[PDB]
Amino acid sequence: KGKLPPVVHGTTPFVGHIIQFGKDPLGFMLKAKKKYGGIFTMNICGNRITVVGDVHQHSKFFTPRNEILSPREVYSFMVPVFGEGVAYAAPYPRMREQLNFLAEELTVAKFQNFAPSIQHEVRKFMKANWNKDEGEINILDDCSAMIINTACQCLFGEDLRKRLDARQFAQLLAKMESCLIPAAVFLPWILKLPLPQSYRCRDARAELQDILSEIIIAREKEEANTSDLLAGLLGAVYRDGTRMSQHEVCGMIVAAMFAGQHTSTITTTWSLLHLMDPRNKRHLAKLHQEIDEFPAQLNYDNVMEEMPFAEQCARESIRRDPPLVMLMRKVLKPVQVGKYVVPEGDIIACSPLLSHQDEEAFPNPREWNPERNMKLVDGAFCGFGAGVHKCIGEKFGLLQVKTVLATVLRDYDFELLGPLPEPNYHTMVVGPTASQCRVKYIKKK
Amino acid sequence: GKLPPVVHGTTPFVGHIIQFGKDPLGFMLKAKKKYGGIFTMNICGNRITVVGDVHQHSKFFTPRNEILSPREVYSFMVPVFGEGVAYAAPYPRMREQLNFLAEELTVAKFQNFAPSIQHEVRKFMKANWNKDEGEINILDDCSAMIINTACQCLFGEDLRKRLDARQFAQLLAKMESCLIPAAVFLPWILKLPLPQSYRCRDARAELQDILSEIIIAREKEEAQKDTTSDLLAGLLGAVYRDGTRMSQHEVCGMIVAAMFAGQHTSTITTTWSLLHLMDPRNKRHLAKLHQEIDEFPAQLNYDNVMEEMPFAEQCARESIRRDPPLVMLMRKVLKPVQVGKYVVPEGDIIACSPLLSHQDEEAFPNPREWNPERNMKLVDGAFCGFGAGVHKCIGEKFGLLQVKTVLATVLRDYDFELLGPLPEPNYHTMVVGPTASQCRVKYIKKK
Amino acid sequence: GKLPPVVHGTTPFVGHIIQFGKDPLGFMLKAKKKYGGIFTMNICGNRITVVGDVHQHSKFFTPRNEILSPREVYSFMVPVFGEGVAYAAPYPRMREQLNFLAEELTVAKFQNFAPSIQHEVRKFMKANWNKDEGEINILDDCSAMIINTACQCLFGEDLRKRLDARQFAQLLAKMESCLIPAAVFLPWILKLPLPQSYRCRDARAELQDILSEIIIAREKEEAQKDTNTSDLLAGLLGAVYRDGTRMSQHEVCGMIVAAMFAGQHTSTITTTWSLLHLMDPRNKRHLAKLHQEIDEFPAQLNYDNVMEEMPFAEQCARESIRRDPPLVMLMRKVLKPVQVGKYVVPEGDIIACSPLLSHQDEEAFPNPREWNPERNMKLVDGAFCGFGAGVHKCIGEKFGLLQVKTVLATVLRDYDFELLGPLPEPNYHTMVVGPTASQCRVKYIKKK
Amino acid sequence: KGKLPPVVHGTTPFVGHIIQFGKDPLGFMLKAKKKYGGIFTMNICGNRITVVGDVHQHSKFFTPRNEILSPREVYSFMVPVFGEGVAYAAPYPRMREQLNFLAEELTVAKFQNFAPSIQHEVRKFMKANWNKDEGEINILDDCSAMIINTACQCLFGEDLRKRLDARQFAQLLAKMESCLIPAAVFLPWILKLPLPQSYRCRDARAELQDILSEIIIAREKEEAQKDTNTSDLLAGLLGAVYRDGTRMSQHEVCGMIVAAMFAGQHTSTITTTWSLLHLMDPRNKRHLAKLHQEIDEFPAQLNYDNVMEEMPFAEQCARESIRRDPPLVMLMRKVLKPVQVGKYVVPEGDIIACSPLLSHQDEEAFPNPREWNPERNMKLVDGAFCGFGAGVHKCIGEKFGLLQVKTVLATVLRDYDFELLGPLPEPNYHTMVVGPTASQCRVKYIKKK
Numbered sequence A: 001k002g003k004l005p006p007v008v009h010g011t012t013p014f015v016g017h018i019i020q021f022g023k024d025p026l027g028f029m030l031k032a033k034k035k036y037g038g039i040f041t042m043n044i045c046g047n048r049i050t051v052v053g054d055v056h057q058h059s060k061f062f063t064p065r066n067e068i069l070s071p072r073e074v075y076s077f078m079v080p081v082f083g084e085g086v087a088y089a090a091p092y093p094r095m096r097e098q099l100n101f102l103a104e105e106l107t108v109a110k111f112q113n114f115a116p117s118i119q120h121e122v123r124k125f126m127k128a129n130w131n132k133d134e135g136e137i138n139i140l141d142d143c144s145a146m147i148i149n150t151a152c153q154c155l156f157g158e159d160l161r162k163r164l165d166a167r168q169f170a171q172l173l174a175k176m177e178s179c180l181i182p183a184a185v186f187l188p189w190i191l192k193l194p195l196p197q198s199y200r201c202r203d204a205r206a207e208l209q210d211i212l213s214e215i216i217i218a219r220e221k222e223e224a225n226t227s228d229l230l231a232g233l234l235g236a237v238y239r240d241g242t243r244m245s246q247h248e249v250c251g252m253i254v255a256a257m258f259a260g261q262h263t264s265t266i267t268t269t270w271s272l273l274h275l276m277d278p279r280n281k282r283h284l285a286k287l288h289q290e291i292d293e294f295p296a297q298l299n300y301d302n303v304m305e306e307m308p309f310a311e312q313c314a315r316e317s318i319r320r321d322p323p324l325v326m327l328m329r330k331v332l333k334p335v336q337v338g339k340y341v342v343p344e345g346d347i348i349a350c351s352p353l354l355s356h357q358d359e360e361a362f363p364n365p366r367e368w369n370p371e372r373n374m375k376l377v378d379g380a381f382c383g384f385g386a387g388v389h390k391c392i393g394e395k396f397g398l399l400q401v402k403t404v405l406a407t408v409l410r411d412y413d414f415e416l417l418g419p420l421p422e423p424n425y426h427t428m429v430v431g432p433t434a435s436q437c438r439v440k441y442i443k444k445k
Numbered sequence B: 001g002k003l004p005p006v007v008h009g010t011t012p013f014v015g016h017i018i019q020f021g022k023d024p025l026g027f028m029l030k031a032k033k034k035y036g037g038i039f040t041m042n043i044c045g046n047r048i049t050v051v052g053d054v055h056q057h058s059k060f061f062t063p064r065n066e067i068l069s070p071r072e073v074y075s076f077m078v079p080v081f082g083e084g085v086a087y088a089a090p091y092p093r094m095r096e097q098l099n100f101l102a103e104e105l106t107v108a109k110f111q112n113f114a115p116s117i118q119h120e121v122r123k124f125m126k127a128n129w130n131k132d133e134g135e136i137n138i139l140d141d142c143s144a145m146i147i148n149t150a151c152q153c154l155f156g157e158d159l160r161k162r163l164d165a166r167q168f169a170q171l172l173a174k175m176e177s178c179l180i181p182a183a184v185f186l187p188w189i190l191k192l193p194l195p196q197s198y199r200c201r202d203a204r205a206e207l208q209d210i211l212s213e214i215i216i217a218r219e220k221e222e223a224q225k226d227t228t229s230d231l232l233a234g235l236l237g238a239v240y241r242d243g244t245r246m247s248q249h250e251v252c253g254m255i256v257a258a259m260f261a262g263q264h265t266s267t268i269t270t271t272w273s274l275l276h277l278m279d280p281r282n283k284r285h286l287a288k289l290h291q292e293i294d295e296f297p298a299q300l301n302y303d304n305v306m307e308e309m310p311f312a313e314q315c316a317r318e319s320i321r322r323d324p325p326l327v328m329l330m331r332k333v334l335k336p337v338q339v340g341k342y343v344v345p346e347g348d349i350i351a352c353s354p355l356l357s358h359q360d361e362e363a364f365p366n367p368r369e370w371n372p373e374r375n376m377k378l379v380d381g382a383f384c385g386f387g388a389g390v391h392k393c394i395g396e397k398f399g400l401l402q403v404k405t406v407l408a409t410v411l412r413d414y415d416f417e418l419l420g421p422l423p424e425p426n427y428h429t430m431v432v433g434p435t436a437s438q439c440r441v442k443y444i445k446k447k
Numbered sequence C: 001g002k003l004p005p006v007v008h009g010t011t012p013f014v015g016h017i018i019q020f021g022k023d024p025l026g027f028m029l030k031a032k033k034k035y036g037g038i039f040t041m042n043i044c045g046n047r048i049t050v051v052g053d054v055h056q057h058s059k060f061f062t063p064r065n066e067i068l069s070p071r072e073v074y075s076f077m078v079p080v081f082g083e084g085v086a087y088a089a090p091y092p093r094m095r096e097q098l099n100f101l102a103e104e105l106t107v108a109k110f111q112n113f114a115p116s117i118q119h120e121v122r123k124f125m126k127a128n129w130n131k132d133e134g135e136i137n138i139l140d141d142c143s144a145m146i147i148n149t150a151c152q153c154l155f156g157e158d159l160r161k162r163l164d165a166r167q168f169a170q171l172l173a174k175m176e177s178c179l180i181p182a183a184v185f186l187p188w189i190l191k192l193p194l195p196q197s198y199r200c201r202d203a204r205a206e207l208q209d210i211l212s213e214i215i216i217a218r219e220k221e222e223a224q225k226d227t228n229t230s231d232l233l234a235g236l237l238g239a240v241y242r243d244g245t246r247m248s249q250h251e252v253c254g255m256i257v258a259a260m261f262a263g264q265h266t267s268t269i270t271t272t273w274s275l276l277h278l279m280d281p282r283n284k285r286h287l288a289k290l291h292q293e294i295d296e297f298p299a300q301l302n303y304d305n306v307m308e309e310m311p312f313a314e315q316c317a318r319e320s321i322r323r324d325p326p327l328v329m330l331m332r333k334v335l336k337p338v339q340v341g342k343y344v345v346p347e348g349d350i351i352a353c354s355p356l357l358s359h360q361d362e363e364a365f366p367n368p369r370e371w372n373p374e375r376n377m378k379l380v381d382g383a384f385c386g387f388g389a390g391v392h393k394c395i396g397e398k399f400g401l402l403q404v405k406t407v408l409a410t411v412l413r414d415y416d417f418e419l420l421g422p423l424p425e426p427n428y429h430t431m432v433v434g435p436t437a438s439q440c441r442v443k444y445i446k447k448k
Numbered sequence D: 001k002g003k004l005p006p007v008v009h010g011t012t013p014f015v016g017h018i019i020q021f022g023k024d025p026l027g028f029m030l031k032a033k034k035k036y037g038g039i040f041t042m043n044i045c046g047n048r049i050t051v052v053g054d055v056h057q058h059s060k061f062f063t064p065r066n067e068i069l070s071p072r073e074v075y076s077f078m079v080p081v082f083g084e085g086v087a088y089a090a091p092y093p094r095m096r097e098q099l100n101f102l103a104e105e106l107t108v109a110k111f112q113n114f115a116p117s118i119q120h121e122v123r124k125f126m127k128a129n130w131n132k133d134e135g136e137i138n139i140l141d142d143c144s145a146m147i148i149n150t151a152c153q154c155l156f157g158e159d160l161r162k163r164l165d166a167r168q169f170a171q172l173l174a175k176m177e178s179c180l181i182p183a184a185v186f187l188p189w190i191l192k193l194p195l196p197q198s199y200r201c202r203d204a205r206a207e208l209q210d211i212l213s214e215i216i217i218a219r220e221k222e223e224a225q226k227d228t229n230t231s232d233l234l235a236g237l238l239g240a241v242y243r244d245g246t247r248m249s250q251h252e253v254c255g256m257i258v259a260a261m262f263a264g265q266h267t268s269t270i271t272t273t274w275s276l277l278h279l280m281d282p283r284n285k286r287h288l289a290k291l292h293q294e295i296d297e298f299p300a301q302l303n304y305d306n307v308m309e310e311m312p313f314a315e316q317c318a319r320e321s322i323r324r325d326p327p328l329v330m331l332m333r334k335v336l337k338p339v340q341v342g343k344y345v346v347p348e349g350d351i352i353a354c355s356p357l358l359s360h361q362d363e364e365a366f367p368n369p370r371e372w373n374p375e376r377n378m379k380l381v382d383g384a385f386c387g388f389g390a391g392v393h394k395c396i397g398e399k400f401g402l403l404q405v406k407t408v409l410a411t412v413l414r415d416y417d418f419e420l421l422g423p424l425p426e427p428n429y430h431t432m433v434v435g436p437t438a439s440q441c442r443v444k445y446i447k448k449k
Ligand code: HEM
Pocket: A071, A099, A102, A106, A256, A257, A259, A260, A261, A263, A264, A267, A318, A323, A324, A327, A328, A382, A383, A384, A385, A386, A388, A389, A390, A391, A392, A393, A394, A396, A397, A398
């Protein structure tokens, strides 16, 4: 009993498929699925990675417990950012607890005065950098800018932004992001070489933790209130009565800012790219309807329970081109999947990038269509993952994407300068090709 | 001949990096003291001989490219310049390319740069410093002014509509991001699949398509040919000694090299100077500076800044003497060079540090003191903020043009005040400047 | 939960290697003495904890693969075994594979092995030691006799026609050229464009095509179905995984190379050492007692003569391995923390048992540098782990001992030996540790 | 005043054409030569290498003095084997004298009893290893073994082979060669990595040096009687005298003896092998026939003369094998001063190369290039054949080498016939010295009955 998933042919003797796969990740798998079916095994530098390409077996990957499927080792290449013993790095229970701490820091109830704050930053930026009747900009960069500004304005209190504003923090982030080497998942060793990056990362992170400390100690003096994400983590308590270290606190914060930064920016950038695509005049018009009925100053309910189509666009761009191409786990205990049995020590993966393309659940995959149904196949859509490690920021993330859309589209139109941007898979968080993201903007004179 | 003294305390495979990393300047200061000006570090199996003896600077800046070559030591910048450009190009191709740029930067090319610079510096202040007073990050604001004043001076109008200063400084970041100076000692780093590496290529590619985009339109519109040459136009006119023209690839690479070069160094200089100018200790220097500028009208002309601003230059030059933006100039020894009593073998990396040399107490007594009145020629050849000899900075004139001009304009309308102890230099970055976070300052105008 | 001491004196990025490489045994002898049996070295930024406490051996050999895994620590050998074979393969896949080889080496598979071993050993003697007396390198000669006897026993007649023991010895060399054990601590080594890595690739390719061309040729001739004395290849071709499927020609080639490589070096070293000690003046009594045991035997030995009636010969071989174990460092990757003695070894750490170190423990093996066949191996139950223990315990022990024993009994029945200098000292700079080859010149004597 | 050769398109960001090149060098270059012409420029990890593919300009690569075109930096990857300051690692004048010292040790006047010794080792091995009516062997390995045996027998004196035999020596060559990483030419930093191979090499060369030394201090004591002496290679490199009146150092001696043995080993065996493989190929029946006629005449104990000047076709076979698949596939030089090549100019700092592999496929100079024809005209285009290089560094072992290959061919085929068991081997371009893919060299030998 227990059959093994087919190992993809044409595997180099020792380097595996890392080259074949790297060049064209989507095509590689997309083809591979046809020759061997949904479930198949890649050999990446001696590593067995088995992808769940069958959309009907997703629950098999998102359901099992950490004891069977584990994310600790797979995501260890991020330790430099989070810090040692933080998040995934820590033991499961410790990890479980910490992730939760952040989760509740991003729940609807904590969205007080977030909509206005987002609206405030988006407009200050627009009235700062798009002050001409019409102008040429890189929408990917400008969204990344607007996104970080609004993310900080919401999760950071006033005293924190004064000593460390949005533009300065971004700098710390990039310095810490410069040591994130995703190939480290297949080359754990590369994380042990003498690298300058990992030095600049220790610094940047150490600088942040210093500020935080110097703000906590400042609050502890002025203590003798709109509690932000910071004050939120400093209050949380473990199951044994102890609190988080400033090291742990600093780690979660960074994780939150990184996590929400690129995904939200990409999910916004895409949409805009689609909505401004001539083939979408339909969706663009409908959207304007949905928001033309809104006043200048938006409120919580306005975007949460009254912008369904907007959310559909946000959720459709993520279905077409998922920011996270490959969700991985370490198989600690053998798991039945389809007609196959993925063995222990193997690397098991569900690719949002892949599954999203199954013509069965998503016929005509390469067409950006908000209208199409996401539930057509249950568990098929995994843009925010599912089960144990479901995105705990989906709500907060959608809030931004949507509020930024509304804001931008209410005041500006857009046109493409060339063919639609094609996804670039050479980045940890996948987004449209930056060099293909040059666009013109129409002001509403 | 005998080899220099190899500073002891070397680790099995690391070498001195660990200790050099912690403090480069301190490390050398200590070494020079113990071993003398000429000593040898070992950086990951790589031998690097620094010319600490200030008297021997010419031994470094003088020899021809046959003996000393910057080609292999500057390759890590290929991602910025592009394949086969600048250093990444054949030796003679490098010389010709660098000349073409040197010619595009001669004083003869500064006709309305003065007015341009002031315009941008007055649009920024009136837009970012409008309150009676306020707190800001000077280093960040000077950077913004510098890229603006550069793009306004070197970039034609038709080019600036496709890519304004802001969006250009945007593409620089994405390209500077890939830069890994350490690659000089750990070459395999470049061979490693790193995101940054992809970043740079795409950023450079984006600037590439705009330039070409811009170019051909110029040819189409070029038909009338009846009546102001920018940098892009100048380069496109350069013809090699073999009768061929630079390729759009080479034209792009050179423009980036120019902008990248003048962007960081110019802002770092302008900023430092300002910081020293607002320090209590330097009350006298600030007073003398105003006198020199108080005489000038609203609109400054080329002469005013160049010939009639001698102390301004001394301040800027002194700011580069104290905290030199380019801390380590390197070369590859292709043939043994006699330095002092010593002889540097071939294959060895020879280095002159404007940072270490600018601390020489003989040449610069009270080194950590910012004194515009000090004598730079005390030891002829000591100061090398602009490198020297064969590879002397080809943008010194244009650079000083901005700095001096920018200061005259800002200080004419504003005063400044520190918010803490004067920032310390941050050595972690490829172009050394004052620690960013320490650069918040308050501004004041006294109409 | 307390960590084992980290032996002090570590350079920044190198670790203890430089020191350890100079002298591994001396380093572990010095460590063990200072910090106690359980300690931790650093090897190029890799924590490696050696279970030197000879009373804690079970805590290394016993844990299940989930906890302690050999898979990654043995991946530098992939170029030899092949992609997804043996260690490279998934654990279930692996465990089954090794069991197949296991079953092809049970004592039930020694039908005419003894006679085959003698024939070779006598063919070699009468071809290379024909003079009244002569000078020879006994290590080199034992290597030949061992590869000849192994091939004779395991390879069918058709296989040996295409690839004789000499030809196969070549392939082994070509293949074991790449191996870079250091790849264990410096993995990127395997990524570099090294000549070695291509050589392996090609050599295993050669052996690969011959096995395949032999198989398809056995299938055509199979049309007759005449009685065939199934060889090692035959048996593996007859193995079936729990999932019904059969071993591929690739995996079949791997297990054959695996066994041949494993037995060739360890068998020859054990043989040579034993001969070396037996000819050492200090061991006149031991040689004398050995002859007594084998004088009673006839020209043609049988399975029972060597198995149940050569207990002192085996002792000699077993004590040779106790003194100078061929496999010096057994390693595992720690997946889940393990309680060892008082200490706890954290996950991500490499755990090791060094037979070499363990076999020197004075409480277990007093006067440890003395080759004493009379010594008690079980003085401290568990101390001796020449053949490993627990889950991965050697599966060729019996077959290996069969050879060493049968060979000793043949050689010493017709020959005597004298050293030409001080007894050879082990050379630790090889993947499998044996006596120094250059110190291996020896004088032989015809008996009669 | 000059034009730069075209640079081939499609360059990967940091690895250049390295991946494409590595796959199929011959093809890559062939296609490049086609698209761009004989003189083109590849980019190997930021390194510009210009290949003189125009078989008419070969002289512009082999001629120039060292000051213009230098082999030092290009050949520094062999330093671990020759040693610091030896051979190319040395200063040119120093270098030249050392090669000279080796040259005069390999001239034809030193060969009287070479032929007989060669035959002896070849036969000893055949009767030792091919003593059956017919058998299956890897002709590559076996020729390798015979070649290393004969070489030693010819250059080492008895007292040495006593202390050192061809089996032990080959064992040291192996150890040392394990550090020869050709790629190190483009990726020098490679040689600075903590690799165990470089330690194994230090130890092999230091062990060989000690052996040689104990032999020398012995030849200096056994000296007093001064018994009749036939000096071996070692004896000769001990008498050589620099222009400054000083003698080589045991380190320098240890290097040259090693460089000689290495250079002589692989090429001799690769050429002998290929030859044998082509002769056993059914398509070359007439060539195999013509060869048997040239040797049949000779007696068992071949003589220096009859092998030197009475075995012409036998030599043409060795020389056409080298022309088809040159062992040394890429001859490089560092350009210190620019050089005019054809219309183009090769700039300083650039790596320049002459590819025997590429030039040898020139349809004009060698029509039907992939066809092994020993009757072809090698001079059809004067200068086109460069298997033994030319000019400043032309092979000094050419004559000693051919002497081996030919004598080995005459001995082997006199008693044995061969049949391929598969298709003609294809060259394996993944080794420092290029030969037939070893795994494809299994062949059937047949005792002449
Ligand atoms: C709309 C944009 C977003 C997308 C498309 C997205 C996508 C995902 C996906 C696919 C996963 C599952 C990863 C896996 O299976 O290993 C995940 C998990 C996670 N996300 Fe996001 N995410 C988004 C926004 C955010 C935001 C805004 C935050 C916080 C501010 C965040 C924080 C997290 C965290 C902490 C987890 C791990 C949860 C756990 O391990 O239990 N994400 N996200």
